Amino acid sequence: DIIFRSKLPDIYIPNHLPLHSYCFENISEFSSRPCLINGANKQIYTYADVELNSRKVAAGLHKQGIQPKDTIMILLPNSPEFVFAFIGASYLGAISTMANPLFTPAEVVKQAKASSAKIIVTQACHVNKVKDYAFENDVKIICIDSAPEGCLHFSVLTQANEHDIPEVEIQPDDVVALPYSSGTTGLPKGVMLTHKGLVTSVAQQVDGENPNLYIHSEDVMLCVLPLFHIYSLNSVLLCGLRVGAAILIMQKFDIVSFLELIQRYKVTIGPFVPPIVLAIAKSPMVDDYDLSSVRTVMSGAAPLGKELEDTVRAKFPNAKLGQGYGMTEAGPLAMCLAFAKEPFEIKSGACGTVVRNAEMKIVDPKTGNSLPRNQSGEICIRGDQIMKGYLNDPEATARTIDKEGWLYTGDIGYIDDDDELFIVDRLKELIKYKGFQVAPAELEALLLNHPNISDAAVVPMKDEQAGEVPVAFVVRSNGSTITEDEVKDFISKQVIFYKRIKRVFFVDAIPKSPSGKILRKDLRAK
Numbered sequence: 060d061i062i063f064r065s066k067l068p069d070i071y072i073p074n075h076l077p078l079h080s081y082c083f084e085n086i087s088e089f090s091s092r093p094c095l096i097n098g099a100n101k102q103i104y105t106y107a108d109v110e111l112n113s114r115k116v117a118a119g120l121h122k123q124g125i126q127p128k129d130t131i132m133i134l135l136p137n138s139p140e141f142v143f144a145f146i147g148a149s150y151l152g153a154i155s156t157m158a159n160p161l162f163t164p165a166e167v168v169k170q171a172k173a174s175s176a177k178i179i180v181t182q183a184c185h186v187n188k189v190k191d192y193a194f195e196n197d198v199k200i201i202c203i204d205s206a207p208e209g210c211l212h213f214s215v216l217t218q219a220n221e222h223d224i225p226e227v228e229i230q231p232d233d234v235v236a237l238p239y240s241s242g243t244t245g246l247p248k249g250v251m252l253t254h255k256g257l258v259t260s261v262a263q264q265v266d267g268e269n270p271n272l273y274i275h276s277e278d279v280m281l282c283v284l285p286l287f288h289i290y291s292l293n294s295v296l297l298c299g300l301r302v303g304a305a306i307l308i309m310q311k312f313d314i315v316s317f318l319e320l321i322q323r324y325k326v327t328i329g330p331f332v333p334p335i336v337l338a339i340a341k342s343p344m345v346d347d348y349d350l351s352s353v354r355t356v357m358s359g360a361a362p363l364g365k366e367l368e369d370t371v372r373a374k375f376p377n378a379k380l381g382q383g384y385g386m387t388e389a390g391p392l393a394m395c396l397a398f399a400k401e402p403f404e405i406k407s408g409a410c411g412t413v414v415r416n417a418e419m420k421i422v423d424p425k426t427g428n429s430l431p432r433n434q435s436g437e438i439c440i441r442g443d444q445i446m447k448g449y450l451n452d453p454e455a456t457a458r459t460i461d462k463e464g465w466l467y468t469g470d471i472g473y474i475d476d477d478d479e480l481f482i483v484d485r486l487k488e489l490i491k492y493k494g495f496q497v498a499p500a501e502l503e504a505l506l507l508n509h510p511n512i513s514d515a516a517v518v519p520m521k522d523e524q525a526g527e528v529p530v531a532f533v534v535r536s537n538g539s540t541i542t543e544d545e546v547k548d549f550i551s552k553q554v555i556f557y558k559r560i561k562r563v564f565f566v567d568a569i570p571k572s573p574s575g576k577i578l579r580k581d582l583r584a585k
């Protein structure tokens with residue numbers, strides 16, 4: 060096995076600590092400081108307020124019948140209540156499964172069932188999605204805003220007394236978070252993330268003498284990324300709490316709101332995804348705003364090419380900018396070392412250096428051999444931060460994490476001479492044209508370079524005599540009349556022949572997950 064490790068040294072990680080105990084370990088150093096800020100209504104909770112409310116929610120959840128290893132479902136947009144419920148369940152040795160509140164009724168009930176959730180925490184507007192299932196199956200509904208009939212109100216939880224939390228012995232391998240993901244192979248799976256696992260991931264990012272991601276108690280981190288997904292939950296909320304930073308909560312990305320809040324609150328840490336990066340590059344109004352407070356700009360969760368990366372870099376010239384790479388199954392696998400307290404130099408388009416306290420290898424899919432530097436293969440990772448497994452699915456677990464503890468990602472990439480990882484694309488997303496592999500993300504990146512294209516996606520199309528050809532879905536810049544042949548030519552002049560785009564279909568919007576991924580499967584259906 061050829062093994063890769065971080066340019067940083069391994070550190071001591073106290074992963075015997077419950078998640079809440081770890082995140083609030085240093086709370087007395089910053090108990091008075093801002094912890095959570097509600098962007099919508101201006102409200103501020105201090106660190107003390109947040110530990111207090113979480114303790115109370117714990118006592119209230121117990122009084123509602125939550126025991127250790129029981130499951131609650133959080134069905135909420137980003138909010139203080141998401142956080143209180145999440146940590147609240149943690150105090151009980153219980154589990155939060157979190158879900159996109161914009162799921163259809165059928166998706167909600169499916170997750171509620173597969174997780175065995177005993178309580179759903181949500182908004183009044185989403186009650187109709189779950190009411191009938193919940194009432195027929197002894198599942199309580201708690202709403203944060205108003206309580207429809209048959210429902211309870213969140214304040215029922217915060218009424219409970221802070222020192223009424225039952226005695227509990229939480230084990231390191233006890234589950235605390237159950238996000239669902241379709242990422243690797245198949246239908247939605249319950250990803251069992253443990254106290255030990257999450258404490259490990261957080262530490263890998265923000266602890267140590269030279270942390271991989273330097274953040275401190277005077278920082279203000281923007282929380283626009285969805286907390287129901289691992290990137291925000293882990294890198295924004297849990298990392299933010301650990302270091303005592305202020306966390307500014309936005310319920311929905313809007314380019315105007317986004318810029319105003321960065322300016323108004325003097326945001327210093329900007330955790331973004333490629334769709335937000337792109338809006339920043341393509342938006343004419345970014346110049347009208349003082350964004351000089353931002354010192355760290357991050358992108359993760361989907362492919363981002365070096366050119367778009369370079370473009371936005373110039374719009375935050377006194378900020379360190381770069382990418383991290385992660386999975387529901389693992390939290391971040393690699394993280395940009397330009398974010399380090401004593402920074403390292405980086406290249407644009409890289410997705411970071413493998414985190415410390417971990418091992419990475421690159422495996423040839425054809426042979427199963429580990430590869431040297433500068434060669435493409437399947438990324439594998441081994442460390443205490445990876446999931447315990449898929450909920451009720453040992454066989455999918457055994458298929459994804461081998462007996463030596465290697466997690467096979469399904470992502471193709473290579474590590475270079477400077478220990479920086481580059482992702483090419485998901486193994487299965489590669490287009491086979493004749494006998495060449497074409498990576499959709501390479502061509503999406505060139506498309507986004509065009510001044511008259513605001514958004515794009517590339518997927519294979521069935522071709523009678525080719526098998527598959529690359530096609531593009533494109534969103535024209537406001538006003539632009541750019542044609543299919545102009546887009547095809549624009550691409551054709553830059554690439555070797557097998558990478559050519561065969562058709563361009565023009566649309567109003569590219570379908571994207573809230574985590575910032577192109578919904579490639581919806582386009583294939585179209």
Ligand SMILES: COC1=CC(/C=C/C(=O)OP(=O)(O)OC[C@H]2O[C@@H](n3cnc4c(N)ncnc43)[C@H](O)[C@@H]2O)=CCC1=O
Pocket residue numbers: 240241242289290291293294357358359360361362363382383384385386387388390391410468470482484485574
């Ligand atoms: C700042 O970096 C961080 C990112 C993440 C991402 C989790 C996630 O992404 O969701 P999931 O549905 O499981 O799908 C995971 C899949 O998304 C793709 N992906 C991810 N990041 C990249 C990237 N930088 N470049 C190219 N592709 C990428 C990749 O295929 C991975 O398996 C968490 C924490 C973190 O700190």
